[PDB]
Assembly symmetry: C3
Amino acid sequence: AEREFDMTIEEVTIKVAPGLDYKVFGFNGQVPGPLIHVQEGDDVIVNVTNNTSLPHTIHWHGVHQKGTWRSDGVPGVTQQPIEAGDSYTYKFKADRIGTLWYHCHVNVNEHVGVRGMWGPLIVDPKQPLPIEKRVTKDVIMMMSTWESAVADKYGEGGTPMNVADYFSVNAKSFPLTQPLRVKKGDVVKIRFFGAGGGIHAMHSHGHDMLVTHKDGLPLDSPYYADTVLVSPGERYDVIIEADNPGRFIFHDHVDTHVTAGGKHPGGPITVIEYDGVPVDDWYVWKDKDYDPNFFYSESLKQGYGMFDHDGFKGEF
Amino acid sequence: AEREFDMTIEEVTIKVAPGLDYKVFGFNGQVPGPLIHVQEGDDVIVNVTNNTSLPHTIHWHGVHQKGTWRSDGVPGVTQQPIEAGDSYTYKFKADRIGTLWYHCHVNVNEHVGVRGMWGPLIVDPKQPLPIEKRVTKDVIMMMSTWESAVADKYGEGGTPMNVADYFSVNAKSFPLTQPLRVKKGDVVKIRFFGAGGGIHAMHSHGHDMLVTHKDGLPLDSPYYADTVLVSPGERYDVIIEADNPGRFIFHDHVDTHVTAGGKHPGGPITVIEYDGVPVDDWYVWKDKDYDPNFFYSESLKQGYGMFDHDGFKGEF
Amino acid sequence: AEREFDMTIEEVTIKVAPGLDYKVFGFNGQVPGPLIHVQEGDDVIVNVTNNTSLPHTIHWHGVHQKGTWRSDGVPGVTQQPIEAGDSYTYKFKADRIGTLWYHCHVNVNEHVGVRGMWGPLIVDPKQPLPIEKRVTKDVIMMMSTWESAVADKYGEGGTPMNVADYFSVNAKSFPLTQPLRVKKGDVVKIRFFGAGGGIHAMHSHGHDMLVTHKDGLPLDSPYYADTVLVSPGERYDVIIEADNPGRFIFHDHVDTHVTAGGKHPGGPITVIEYDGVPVDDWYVWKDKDYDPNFFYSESLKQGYGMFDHDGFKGEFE
Ligand SMILES: [Cl-]
Ligand SMILES: [Cu+2]
Ligand SMILES: [Cu+2]
Ligand SMILES: [Cu+2]
Ligand SMILES: [Cu+2]
Ligand SMILES: [Cu+2]
Ligand SMILES: [Cu+2]
Ligand SMILES: [Cu+2]
Ligand SMILES: [Cu+2]
Ligand SMILES: [Cu+2]
Ligand SMILES: [Cu+2]
Ligand SMILES: [Cu+2]
Ligand SMILES: [Cu+2]
Ligand SMILES: [O-]
Ligand SMILES: [O-]
Ligand SMILES: [O-]
Ligand SMILES: [O]
Ligand SMILES: [O]
Ligand SMILES: [O]
């Protein structure tokens, strides 16, 4: 089918960590950008309006651009950039299946590295794996890093001379991340994204992960892991059988990554929280103000389209 | 069978490199911590006493904690910390096979990152692979990194603002490591662990490695490699057929890691030494005071339980 | 067959990026070093003369040195170093197939990390994969990093204390790299090497890569990827079917790696340029002064032997 979406680029401020508000260029004013969910073979049309002060593009990572290379989104190579105030339309056929993503391709070290210019693009195979058939919950985790020294000033950041001192999943640092709430018997698909410039060793306590897809394509030889290394650009899809009730932390195992501005704990940390496990008095997330769509799992149930999430919106 | 043992946590000092003594929090006062070797299905009981001035826990990485999540060792999630001077008992069933490990889960960026709070946990499968049946020598290699500036300073370190300037295997930097001594026809299992916060590209001269396990689970499709990338939290098991006598260095190929405080050589370097190869007067290790258990290879031969090793003990 | 080569080690200066000239120890005065291309089972003889002021060796990474360990090239382990002005001869049988490489094994954090002491060693299998037979273009991409503070000073660099602020493929930083020119129907083998001390996430726009070999040995279970992580010492071989005409950038996806001295763009970036696509006036590489051998693809067609390339040569003092 033909699916047409309108996107903006906005200058907004987001709260990444306690102690760290960050100036970003949010797609539709949010970080992660809106979930785009379509079916294998669809014709996609995205009209982009640049409501910021600087030029951008959108590149569709993993999208072949079969017969549409002029929509690849690379300045100086497939198009001239989208300037401030201007608009531009992308058209492509979603013939590549799986977990894809989209991001700015202007000044990528800064725009993608620390200005949040990215979001998920999920293409459903017309014919999914048997394994995907059993899935009861779909989960998106986009990891990135932040440089506090340049949080308020567009135009700097993302070089080897900068210090990345805050780490996140879906643009929040623990304890501002949210738990992954499951019930016994759930079949959980988790899609990891190396959205920023760091490497993330994602480790699930209490469970092994079945690695089923690399960069959205199904592996002929899936393998189990308790720790999955995710590096810039990559995606890994895993399956977790939620058959082991408890509270099980789920986090980046890169030691410096579980800090925030030098202080521990912080970073890409969540907790697999099983329904019905009694909450202890000392539980860090006792009485959490809970967001069931922090990993886009509600949005992912709503069919094809473009989904904003107010939990990800920034302030003007 | 039920395996019960007693572990303490001690403030001790170890020598990591010539010129670098390091204050660590050693399990049973040693780094690497004691080897725990059990069989698949064993019931494990660990009585832990914190004889240090700071709180810790012990998390059993790879252990599912099926119906025992309260033994997962995560402060604020599965337990309150073990305070200075107190004791805590962990109980779990070793139903997950393979190369596992354990480490503190309090202040992990420092404690695991630079204070040595880790050790190996090997669970023997009921049904080993055929190649595992042929193994004549079993080898543990736990890689980590060190920040010389905080060598004397508990409560500091393991942040992006620190500099990791020393590198090791089993808490020694070359030349203070030990050779891997083999004889022609040996079948060598090597287990690599990403114990600290760094990434290590483990490369065997003179030989290809067959990669057989990821995080302790057997791959359906094992593959050969001469260089295996090991990142924090991960384990890789390989097999080397010792069929090429010579002296063949075996080391981290990450260029900066074969240094020690800016000097070369150092870091995670050993040498596969074959019996009967004549020794040149210029061979760097011709007069080595040899420790046959530097890779726990002897301990691994002595039954099921917990094993200390005097060569890893620190000074009070 | 017996194949004998004479190699030198020279002090030269290479241009890594606009405004970054770098002092290196180039094999045959070039970085990447010369392509060595032999057949499985050949007996290789390499006579090395050190024309620089410092000691070196050559280690043959991936070469088993079966019964020839004393040619492994490691100082203090298998030999004494090759001192300034001296020579040394390596002999080994190429019985290990695939994408191998060679590099100095003295002071490696500096010599391999920033002095360009490395080059590719390709061993053709007697029995290549079926897919390898469809290949119409073979491509070598050797990634490394550079520390500008020590560009002019042999004897320093390659430590945790240093800052790697420039990045390259085959020792050039975009825009001084060259495009990968194909035509529709091409079958492209690319061989990625982690020559330096950095990690590189190589991403092909417009195409998936079929990953077929790890460290030169064929995988029983090849897999597709659009992003392949390459870390020091490793090689990956992939296949790209060139069936999607466009201009498709191909680059290290590690964000800080697409910079040069703190500026963007730069780093390990090329463009897959399909012959049939009309060139726009704003295209960054319109009228590029083109080197068709930037990825050794012409040398790789020219038979067994050792091949220099002037596009990689630096300047003598
Ligand atoms: Cl064409
Ligand atoms: Cu942008
Ligand atoms: Cu991308
Ligand atoms: Cu892309
Ligand atoms: Cu953990
Ligand atoms: Cu601790
Ligand atoms: Cu762990
Ligand atoms: Cu764990
Ligand atoms: Cu080596
Ligand atoms: Cu050298
Ligand atoms: Cu090497
Ligand atoms: Cu080697
Ligand atoms: Cu790109
Ligand atoms: O952990
Ligand atoms: O090496
Ligand atoms: O990208
Ligand atoms: O990309
Ligand atoms: O863990
Ligand atoms: O090597």
